Design a protein around this nucleic acid. Structure first.
Lengths: 130, 123, 160, 6, 67, 201, 31
RNA sequence: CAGCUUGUUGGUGGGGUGACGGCCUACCAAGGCGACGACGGGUAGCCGGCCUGAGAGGGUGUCCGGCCACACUGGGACUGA
RNA sequence: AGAAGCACCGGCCAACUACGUGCCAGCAGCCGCGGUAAUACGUAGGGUGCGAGCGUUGUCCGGAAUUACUGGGCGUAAAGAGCUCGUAGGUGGUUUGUCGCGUUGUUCGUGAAAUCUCACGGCUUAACUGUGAGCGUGCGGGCGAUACGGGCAGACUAGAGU
RNA sequence: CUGGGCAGUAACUGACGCUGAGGAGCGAAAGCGUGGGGAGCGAACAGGAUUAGAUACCCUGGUAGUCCACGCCGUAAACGGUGGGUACUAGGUGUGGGUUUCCUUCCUUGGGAUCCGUGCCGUAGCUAACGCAUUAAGUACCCCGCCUGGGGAGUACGGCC
RNA sequence: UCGAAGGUGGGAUCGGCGAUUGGGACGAAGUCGUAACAAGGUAGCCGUACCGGAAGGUGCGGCUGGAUC
C-alpha cells in the first residue's frame, strides 16, 4: 500500500465513471488542500472535512447536474514515486492550453498553472485534471 | 521493457540489423576475377535460366553474381565490377556485375535505358 | 450539397457450395466544409448501390465539430476499440497533415490547420472510427464553462 | 528422368 | 590504515534521460594526522593536495556521532 | 537549373488550363494533353497536388531545385507558407516586369531581363530570379532605346494591370514597389496549400 | 491448431535425444 | 572475463622533482579495488560540430576550428624558458 | 547564329498504345510478369519526372510507436521464473518541528570563435561571406522560500505484527 | 509429535511494510545410486491373432519398474496457459468457516449486518475478438521477471552443476 | 643498480587447414510407409525412460488447446 494520490484520484475516476454521489476517503493535509484548489477551479462540487472515529475523513461531492454529464473528464498523475518530475517556470506544462490544470508544489505551496506562470516559479508537477 | 528502474538496472538495445554484404567491408563495388559461368535454374514458379558466375573478389572469396542483360562475352575470366542488388529467385545470388565496364562490353542493340547494361548512344 | 470523399474500396467473398459470391463495398464520407460530417460504409454487389447506401448512412449520421476558425480546441487522443490517432490544433497550422483518409475526413470537415498522425492499426476503417472518436471527445470553451464557472479566463489570445 | 528431389 | 580513514561518499544524480533520482556511492581517503572518530559517525571532509594514492580528502569536523 | 525551353501546349493542356497564353488567348482546344488524353483519368492527391506545383513552376518558369529553396524560406517565415511563397515569388524581377506588361510573354520578359534590357537602381543586372524589394527601382537600360520592346511594349502595357503594391512610372518605367507584394490579395490563379502539403510528402 | 506451435519443438527435441542415445558412448563421450 | 591487488595499500624517515605526491627510496603496518561492474578481452583519437529527425533521440566526428598522441620500429638522455 | 540530355512509365508511384515475343528468352525494390492476343520482357511511338545533369550500387537516419523517456507489450497472438523465502538494491503510511541535500526562483561568472535560428548588410542574385541579436538546453559561486521529496530529532495510530 | 490459517476481542509495539536481481530452500510421475521388498499390474521382451507388410492397436504370458529405508538429477499443461502486493468501482444467485442482530421462537436455528475463502451468472468499463468482470483480462501506484518475425534453436562452441 | 633488444622454456588466448563425420537448409514430377487435422479410424498433447529404419509406438503420472454426455 502506497501512493495515496493514486487512490485519491482513482476513487474519483470510479465515481465519475459510475456517477455516484460522493467519495469518502481518509483525511490528510494534501488531500484537503488539493480539494480546495479543485473546488476553486470548479471542476468538483463541494467537499467536507468529516471525522468519523479512527482519524479524520473527507467527502467529495461529484460535480454534475446540467445533465447526467459529469463536469470531470478524467486525470493522470505524472510524478510517480520513482519518477519525480519537477519543472522550471519557463518550461511549465501546457497541457490542454489553459484547460489541463496541473497542480504544482512550489516554494510557496500548491497552485495552478496560470498562477505559477504569473509568479514565475517552478516546482513539482503532481497531476493533471484534463 | 517498462519499469524505469528496470531500465536503469538494465539498459536497452534494438534488434541488430545484419550487415547485408561481404563486399570488402561493404565498399560499394569491387573487382572480381570473374570465373565459372553457370546458367542455373531458379525456384519452381519461374521456369527460366539465369546467367550467373562463381567469381573471386579481392577479399579472396567465391561469390555468386548475376549477369544482367542478354548475351555475354565471358570465358570464366575477364574481370568484372560487382555491385549490389538481389533476385530472390536464385538462392545464393547476392551480387550483380555491371555490363560494359573494365572488361565486359555493354549489351548490344539496346536502345532504352542507355545508362545501364553498358548501353550507349548510337555513336 | 455536400462534399464527397471516398475511401479505397475493398472486396468480400461469401463462399457457397458452388463457389464464391464476390461483393464490393467502400467506406464513403461527406461533409459540408463546416464539421458536419457524415460517415457511411454500405455494401452490395453493385459498387454504386453500396455507395449510395453509404451516402444515406452519412445523411443519417452527422457530428458537429467544435471548430475554431478551421481547427480544433485542444489535442486529442483518438483511441478507439482498435485504432489510435493522436492529433493537435497546430494553432498556426497553415496546412492540414494527417494520414490516409483521415485527411479526407478533414477535407469533409473543412479544416485548414491540423497536425495529426495515425498509430496502431492501419486498417483504414478503424482508423476512421478512431478519428470519429477523437471528434466526439472534443469540446468548446463555453461548454467547459458548463463544467466550471468563470469562463473566458483561459489561454486563447486568438479565438475569433 | 531427376537431378533434384526427383 | 594508520593516519587515514575510509569514508563513504554519498551523493545523488539523475539519469540523463529517464530522470530518476538515484543515489551515488563513492569511497574516499580521509587522511589525517590524528584519528578522532569511530565508525558510523558523520564527518565533514575536504579536498587538499595529494599525499598518497590520490589522498585528497581530509578530516575536518566530527558531527552526529554513531550510537 | 535552366529554362524549360519548349512548347506551352504540352503543359497547359496537361494541367488543363492555359497558364499564360500569349498572342492567342488560348489554343481553343479540348482537354486531352496528348494521344490518349481524351480518356477519363483516375485522380490522386499526388497527381492533383503535383499538377498544382507544376502550375506554379511553369507560371513563373522556375525549376524545382530553386523552388525548394524558396519553399524553405517560406517555411522559415511566419504566416501562411503558401502566401509567403507567392509573395517571395512576386519579388522576382521577371514577375514584376511581366505584371507591368512590358513584354508579349513572360518568356519574352525573362529574355529581355536576362539580356539586361531592364537594369536596376544602379546595376546592369541579368538575373530573372533577382529578389526585388521595396524601393528597388528598375532602370530601363539606355542601350535598350531605339529598339522595339520598350516603346511598343509601353504602348501595349495595358494588357497587364499594374500590381496594387507597386507603381510603374511608364515615362521611365521605374517599377517602384511601395508595399509588400501581396499577390495573395490579388490575381491568384491556382492553389498554394496543396503545394505546401505536397512538399511535406 | 495452436498445437502446431508445439509440434516443431517436439520433433526437434526428439531428433536431438535420439541422436545422443545413438551416442552416449566413446562415439561422443571421448569428445 | 568476477576475484583483482605486495611498490599493491598506509605510515615514518630520506632523497628527488619546476612541484604536493610510495614520483623514488630504507624501515615499519596489512591493507586497497570490486556486481553503485575489479582484473581482462574486443572495438575506437576526443570535442565544437556534420547528417538525419517534429523533437526527444539516432548516426557520425570527414573539411574548417580547438584539444590529445605518433614521426622507419623500439629504448634513453642532453641542451634548453 | 553556337550549346540537351538522362531515367522511368501494371500497382504501390506522375508516368501508355501498338509492334515483336511466346514459362523461352528475359525483367524485378515487395507483390511479381512471360505456358502464341505480355499496358510488367525487346523495339517504335506516346506520355511523365528532372535537367548538364540524370540514373544505378553502397552507407546512415527517418519513415519503424518493429527497443517504444516522451512513446509499445506479456489471458490464447513470442513473452509471468515450477513455488516460496530472503540478502544487496528499489520502494516505503498519519504527523510536529528541524537541515535545505534534491528541486524551484534570483544574481554573478561560466558556457570561445566559426557553424545553427532570426534580423540587417555586401559580393550584379544566389550559394557564400559579413554585422548584430538569439541560441549556447548546461556547471560553479552568491542570494531567498520551503511546498513536495530526502536526512536528522520526535510523536500518534488505522498499516503490518504480537 | 508438529506446522499453518480464519473470526471476534483490540491487551502490546508504533511503520518494524511490500517486492526482491544475484543467492538459498521445497518441489508429482518417470529416471538414477546403495540396499530391502516384490501380490497384482506392466515399458522392454516372447509368442499368437490382424494386416500386402505391422518390430503398433487386439489376446496370452512376462523382465525392469511401481512399493519401503537413505541419497542424486531438479524437469512437465510444475496452467487459472493470468507474478506479487496495495486501494477503489452494478448487482444477483449458490457454497464453506465463524461472529453477531429482527422475526427470539416466527424454530429458523430462518432473514439481515460483518470478515475471509469458494463456484456461477451478470451492470459499467476493458478487450482484436473470444471473453473478463469485487477472486478483473476494469480504474491506478510500487517492485520483480520475460520477449521484440519464423526456422536454423532454447541446439552448437564455451562454462557451471 | 636500473634497463632495451634478443634468447631459452612452458603456459594462456584468438584464428585458419584438416581426411573423416554428424546434423541443418534448399531444390517440376524420386523410392517404402501414412503418424497429424473429423472420435483422422488406437483421441491428441507436455515431461520422463525403453524399442524400432521412418513417420512413431509403448508404460507410470499430468492437462484439456479432447469423444459420448
Amino acid at each position: 500500500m502506497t501512493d495515496p494520490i493514486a487512490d485519491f484520484l482513482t476513487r474519483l475516476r470510479n465515481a465519475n465513471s459510475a456517477y455516484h454521489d460522493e467519495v469518502s476517503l481518509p483525511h490528510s493535509k494534501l488531500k484537503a488542500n488539493i480539494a480546495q484548489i479543485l473546488k476553486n477551479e470548479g471542476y468538483i462540487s463541494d467537499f467536507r472535512t468529516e471525522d468519523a472515529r479512527v482519524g479524520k475523513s473527507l467527502v467529495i461531492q461529484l460535480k454534475y447536474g446540467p445533465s447526467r454529464e459529469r463536469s470531470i473528464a478524467g486525470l493522470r498523475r505524472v510524478s510517480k514515486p520513482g519518477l519525480r518530475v519537477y519543472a522550471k517556470s519557463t518550461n511549465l506544462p501546457r497541457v490542454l492550453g489553459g484547460l489541463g490544470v496541473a497542480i504544482i508544489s512550489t516554494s510557496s505551496g500548491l497552485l495552478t498553472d496560470r498562477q505559477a506562470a504569473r509568479q514565475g516559479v517552478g516546482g513539482e508537477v503532481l497531476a493533471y485534471v484534463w | 521493457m517498462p519499469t524505469i528502474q528496470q531500465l536503469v538496472r538494465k539498459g536497452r538495445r534494438d534488434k541488430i540489423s545484419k550487415v547485408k554484404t561481404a563486399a570488402l567491408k561493404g565498399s560499394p563495388q569491387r573487382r572480381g576475377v570473374c570465373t565459372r559461368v553457370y546458367t542455373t535454374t531458379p525456384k519452381k514458379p519461374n521456369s527460366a535460366l539465369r546467367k550467373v558466375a562463381r567469381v573471386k573478389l579481392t577479399s579472396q572469396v567465391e561469390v555468386t553474381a548475376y549477369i544482367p542483360g542478354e548475351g555475354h562475352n565471358l570465358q570464366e575470366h575477364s574481370m568484372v565490377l560487382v555491385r549490389g542488388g538481389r533476385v530472390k529467385d536464385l538462392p545464393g545470388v547476392r551480387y550483380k556485375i555491371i555490363r560494359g565496364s573494365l572488361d565486359t562490353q555493354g549489351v548490344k542493340n539496346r536502345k532504352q535505358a542507355r545508362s545501364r547494361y553498358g548501353a550507349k548512344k548510337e555513336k | 450539397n455536400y462534399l464527397e470523399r471516398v475511401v479505397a474500396i475493398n472486396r468480400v467473398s461469401k463462399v457457397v457450395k458452388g463457389g464464391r459470391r464476390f461483393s464490393f463495398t467502400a467506406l464513403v464520407i461527406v461533409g459540408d466544409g463546416n464539421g458536419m460530417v457524415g460517415v457511411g460504409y454500405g455494401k452490395a454487389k453493385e459498387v454504386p448501390a453500396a455507395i449510395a447506401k453509404g451516402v444515406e448512412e452519412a445523411r443519417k449520421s452527422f457530428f458537429r465539430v467544435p471548430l475554431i476558425g478551421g481547427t480544433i480546441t485542444h489535442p486529442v487522443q483518438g483511441e478507439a476499440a482498435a485504432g489510435v490517432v493522436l492529433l493537435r490544433p497546430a494553432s498556426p497550422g497553415t496546412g492540414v497533415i494527417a494520414g490516409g483518409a483521415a485527411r479526407a475526413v478533414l477535407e469533409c470537415a473543412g479544416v485548414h490547420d491540423i497536425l495529426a498522425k495515425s498509430l496502431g492499426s492501419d486498417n483504414a476503417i478503424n482508423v476512421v472510427h478512431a478519428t470519429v472518436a477523437a471528434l466526439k471527445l472534443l469540446q468548446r470553451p463555453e461548454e467547459v464553462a458548463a463544467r466550471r464557472g468563470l469562463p473566458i479566463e483561459d489561454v486563447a489570445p486568438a479565438g475569433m | 528422368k531427376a537431378x533434384r528431389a526427383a | 590504515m594508520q593516519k587515514t580513514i575510509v569514508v563513504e561518499l554519498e551523493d545523488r544524480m539523475r539519469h540523463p534521460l529517464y530522470g530518476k533520482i538515484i543515489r551515488t556511492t563513492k569511497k574516499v581517503k580521509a587522511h589525517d594526522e590524528d584519528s578522532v572518530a569511530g565508525i558510523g559517525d558523520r564527518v565533514s571532509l575536504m579536498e587538499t593536495r595529494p599525499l598518497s594514492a590520490t589522498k585528497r580528502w581530509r578530516l575536518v569536523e566530527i558531527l552526529e556521532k554513531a550510537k | 537549373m535552366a529554362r524549360y525551353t519548349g512548347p506551352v501546349t504540352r503543359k497547359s493542356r496537361r494541367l488543363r488550363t492555359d497558364l499564360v497564353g500569349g498572342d492567342q488567348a488560348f489554343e481553343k482546344r479540348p482537354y486531352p494533353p496528348g494521344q490518349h488524353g481524351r480518356a477519363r483519368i483516375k485522380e490522386s492527391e499526388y497527381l492533383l497536388q503535383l499538377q498544382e506545383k507544376q502550375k506554379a513552376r511553369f507560371t513563373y518558369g522556375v525549376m524545382e531545385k530553386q523552388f525548394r529553396r524558396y519553399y524553405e524560406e517560406a517555411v522559415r517565415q511566419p504566416g501562411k507558407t503558401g502566401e509567403e511563397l507567392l509573395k517571395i515569388l512576386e519579388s522576382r524581377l521577371d514577375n514584376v516586369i511581366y505584371r507591368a506588361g512590358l513584354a508579349r510573354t513572360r518568356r519574352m520578359a525573362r529574355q529581355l531581363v536576362s539580356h539586361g534590357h531592364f537594369n536596376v537602381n544602379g546595376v546592369h543586372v541579368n538575373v530573372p530570379s533577382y529578389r526585388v524589394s521595396q524601393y528597388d527601382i528598375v532602370d530601363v537600360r539606355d542601350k535598350s532605346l531605339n529598339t522595339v520592346p520598350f516603346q511598343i511594349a509601353r504602348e501595349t502595357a495595358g494588357e497587364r494591370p499594374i500590381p496594387s503594391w507597386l507603381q510603374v512610372v511608364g515615362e521611365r518605367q521605374r517599377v517602384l514597389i511601395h508595399q509588400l507584394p501581396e499577390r495573395a490579395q490579388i490575381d491568384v490563379p491556382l492553389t498554394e496549400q496543396l503545394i505546401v502539403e505536397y512538399y511535406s510528402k | 491448431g495452436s498445437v502446431i506451435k508445439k509440434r516443431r519443438k517436439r520433433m526437434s527435441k526428439k531428433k536431438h535425444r535420439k541422436l545422443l542415445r545413438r551416442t552416449r558412448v566413446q562415439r561422443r563421450k571421448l569428445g
